[PDB]
């Protein structure tokens, strides 16, 4: 019988679990990419220097 409250409450929770852990990896990647940007950035800077 009428479970709607619990079930409806519930979908997001599971989603949250994946969302949180997956996000953590995501940001770690993001920051890593940011490092990529600085690394490539500095690489480009040296490129500019060579001319």
């Amino acid at each position: 019988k009428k479970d709607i409250n619990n079930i409806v409450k519930t979908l997001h929770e599971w989603c949250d679990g994946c969302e949180a852990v997956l996000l953590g990896i995501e940001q770690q990647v993001l920051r890593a990419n940011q490092y990529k940007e600085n690394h490539n950035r500095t690489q480009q800077q040296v490129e500019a220097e060579v001319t």
Binding site: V21, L23, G24, I25, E26, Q27, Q28, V29, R31, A32, Y35, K36, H39
Partner: protein
Amino acid sequence: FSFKKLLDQCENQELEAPGIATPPVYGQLLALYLLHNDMNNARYLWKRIPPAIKSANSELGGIWSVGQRIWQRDFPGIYTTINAHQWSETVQPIMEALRDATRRRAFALVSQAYTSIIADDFAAFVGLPVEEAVKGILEQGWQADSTTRMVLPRKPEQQLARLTDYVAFLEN
């Protein structure tokens, strides 16, 4: 913490008094060391403290006797050096603290070091007697052993950070 806090304070005491500090400063340093079970730096201090001003702290005399014991660690004699003087504010309020530290310490000794333990062992270790020992094995969940005294002390993103650091290293 009170152990570490008081010991650092007594350190500053010795540092700023002169290597000539207060004899109760000395006994407090040494008692705090033994609270931390210090045996070598305590011996530095003993080889770094004025022995005249040491004996000025006869409480420190007993404290260095106790440090000798903790250097040897025959237990009833350790507490007898303990139970020679019991001086509040330089000795005894951390005398109790150190007998309790020894309680947990020789407690793990019983548990982990002793597969089986003689109740006389921890009866010496902090003074907790053999019937106290039965109570303790029963309270922490440790098997008693009668007729032998071989009582049984019962032994009781983040990863994406490291991985993106792998990458950032290779992808420097």
